[PDB]
Write an enzyme that holds these catalytic residues in place. Sequence first.
Site, PDB file in Angstrom:
ATOM      1  N   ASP A  86     -37.829   3.669 -34.736  1.00 57.60           N
ATOM      2  CA  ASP A  86     -38.385   4.875 -35.364  1.00 57.60           C
ATOM      3  C   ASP A  86     -38.362   4.805 -36.894  1.00 57.60           C
ATOM      4  O   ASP A  86     -39.266   5.315 -37.560  1.00 57.60           O
ATOM      5  CB  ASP A  86     -37.631   6.134 -34.911  1.00 57.60           C
ATOM      6  CG  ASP A  86     -37.925   6.510 -33.471  1.00 57.60           C
ATOM      7  OD1 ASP A  86     -38.910   5.999 -32.900  1.00 57.60           O
ATOM      8  OD2 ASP A  86     -37.177   7.334 -32.913  1.00 57.60           O
ATOM      9  N   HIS A 128     -36.056  15.459 -40.378  1.00 55.68           N
ATOM     10  CA  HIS A 128     -35.046  14.954 -39.424  1.00 55.68           C
ATOM     11  C   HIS A 128     -33.891  14.167 -40.053  1.00 55.68           C
ATOM     12  O   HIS A 128     -32.918  13.858 -39.376  1.00 55.68           O
ATOM     13  CB  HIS A 128     -35.705  14.062 -38.371  1.00 55.68           C
ATOM     14  CG  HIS A 128     -36.824  14.721 -37.629  1.00 55.68           C
ATOM     15  ND1 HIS A 128     -36.643  15.849 -36.849  1.00 55.68           N
ATOM     16  CD2 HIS A 128     -38.139  14.407 -37.529  1.00 55.68           C
ATOM     17  CE1 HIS A 128     -37.802  16.205 -36.320  1.00 55.68           C
ATOM     18  NE2 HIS A 128     -38.728  15.345 -36.720  1.00 55.68           N
ATOM     19  N   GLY A 136     -36.245   9.913 -36.772  1.00 50.90           N
ATOM     20  CA  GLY A 136     -37.613  10.371 -36.579  1.00 50.90           C
ATOM     21  C   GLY A 136     -38.585  10.085 -37.718  1.00 50.90           C
ATOM     22  O   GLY A 136     -39.273  10.983 -38.183  1.00 50.90           O
ATOM     23  N   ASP A 163     -43.969  23.000 -37.077  1.00 51.27           N
ATOM     24  CA  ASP A 163     -44.273  21.619 -36.755  1.00 51.27           C
ATOM     25  C   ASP A 163     -44.025  21.505 -35.254  1.00 51.27           C
ATOM     26  O   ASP A 163     -43.370  22.373 -34.682  1.00 51.27           O
ATOM     27  CB  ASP A 163     -43.391  20.674 -37.576  1.00 51.27           C
ATOM     28  CG  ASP A 163     -43.759  19.213 -37.395  1.00 51.27           C
ATOM     29  OD1 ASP A 163     -44.311  18.619 -38.345  1.00 51.27           O
ATOM     30  OD2 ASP A 163     -43.464  18.651 -36.322  1.00 51.27           O
ATOM     31  N   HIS A 165     -42.146  19.447 -33.943  1.00 44.23           N
ATOM     32  CA  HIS A 165     -40.759  19.008 -33.788  1.00 44.23           C
ATOM     33  C   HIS A 165     -39.765  19.879 -34.544  1.00 44.23           C
ATOM     34  O   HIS A 165     -40.007  20.297 -35.676  1.00 44.23           O
ATOM     35  CB  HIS A 165     -40.602  17.553 -34.245  1.00 44.23           C
ATOM     36  CG  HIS A 165     -41.545  16.604 -33.562  1.00 44.23           C
ATOM     37  ND1 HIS A 165     -42.777  16.270 -34.083  1.00 44.23           N
ATOM     38  CD2 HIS A 165     -41.422  15.917 -32.403  1.00 44.23           C
ATOM     39  CE1 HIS A 165     -43.382  15.424 -33.264  1.00 44.23           C
ATOM     40  NE2 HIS A 165     -42.588  15.197 -32.239  1.00 44.23           N
ATOM     41  N   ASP A 252     -49.083  18.101 -36.286  1.00 44.60           N
ATOM     42  CA  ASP A 252     -48.972  17.502 -34.970  1.00 44.60           C
ATOM     43  C   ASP A 252     -48.998  18.557 -33.843  1.00 44.60           C
ATOM     44  O   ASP A 252     -48.824  18.206 -32.687  1.00 44.60           O
ATOM     45  CB  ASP A 252     -47.718  16.619 -34.850  1.00 44.60           C
ATOM     46  CG  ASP A 252     -46.448  17.278 -35.415  1.00 44.60           C
ATOM     47  OD1 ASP A 252     -46.445  18.496 -35.679  1.00 44.60           O
ATOM     48  OD2 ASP A 252     -45.461  16.544 -35.602  1.00 44.60           O
TER      49      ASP A 252
END
Length: 364
Positions: A86, A128, A136, A163, A165, A252
């Site tokens: 990642d 993150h 992330g 977002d 996430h 996203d």
Amino acid sequence: LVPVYIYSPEYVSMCDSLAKIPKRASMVHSLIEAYALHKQMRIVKPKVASMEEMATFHTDAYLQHLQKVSQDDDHPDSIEYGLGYDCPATEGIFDYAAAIGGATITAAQCLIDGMCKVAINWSGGWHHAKKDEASGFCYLNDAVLGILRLRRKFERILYVNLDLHHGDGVEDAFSFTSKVMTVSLHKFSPGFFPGTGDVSDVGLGKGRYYSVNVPIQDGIQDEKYYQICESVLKEVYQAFNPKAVVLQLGADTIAGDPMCSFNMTPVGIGKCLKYILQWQLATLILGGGGYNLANTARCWTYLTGVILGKTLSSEIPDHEFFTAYGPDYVLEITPSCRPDRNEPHRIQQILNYIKGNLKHVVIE
Ligand SMILES: CN(C)c1ccc(C(=O)NCCCCCCC(=O)NO)cc1
Ligand SMILES: [K+]
Ligand SMILES: [Zn+2]
């Protein structure tokens, strides 16, 4: 007064070398430029973050390691510091991290100095990263760095994460304090990254009830999303009385993203953004996820238009990346024919939980 737009040719070139989102920054900037929006903004070259500025949140150990490997994807300390698939230890990654951190810090400083009411860093929003580990795709938490700079002037700062996430790095960083309230609307589902941010997560210790999470399921569209967002932010505003806002607007969540989870359009996000702008507070605008590159540019361009209160042509203007916008070559995004998995009873329950929690804030 006029919005600040954090931009330099070098900054975009550096942001372009991020391995997960190659050329995204250029596409976003070139569409904004193609709509001539930059002419209505104050363009500010971002400063590069210093070791000291980065260390206001990140540990010296982690930062010194990041610097070392940036000059190396097989180091024995990289696993401990979250560097892997990642967050690969790409060459130059420390410079790219320092640029994005510096950009958001620069945005924050502009707000502090009264240069503007809104400051934009579309390439920021890496929410993150932890004090001592990459996570992330995030090597450095510029949102936390931005909030820490705002803390020079503001005693009540609201972070809003819109977002796909959960903004776990930010929420965690302020979990124990009441100076910063975090609000996150995100997908919450077992196995979906990062796995945190249930409505029951409300912060810890002295920060209890100063973290807010709105777990949302696949398929949500503009109208229901805005209703959820407006009702939460209405309660947060009255309860917390923020003096500054850091708003993360990921792309996203938009239909067409290959993550294919939420089913939003830029118009829906725009409504949330309008609701926040009418508070008339110093507002630091950040990007986030966005894995359909053309759609991400469509989204952040449209939202830049909202900030400016400008109505844009639906027809994508010719520019460097025009061909990326086929086959319809329009600014608007159409929702997918996918079901909304959000039960209205569950939405209401979450909202009532949150209202309950914020009651404790009010009575304090
Ligand atoms: C197709 N491909 C190679 C991949 C697809 C998905 C992921 C992933 O979700 N990884 C988990 C980390 C997601 C971090 C998202 C960053 C973000 O948007 N935060 O808001 C990885 C690779
Ligand atoms: K907090
Ligand atoms: Zn995301």
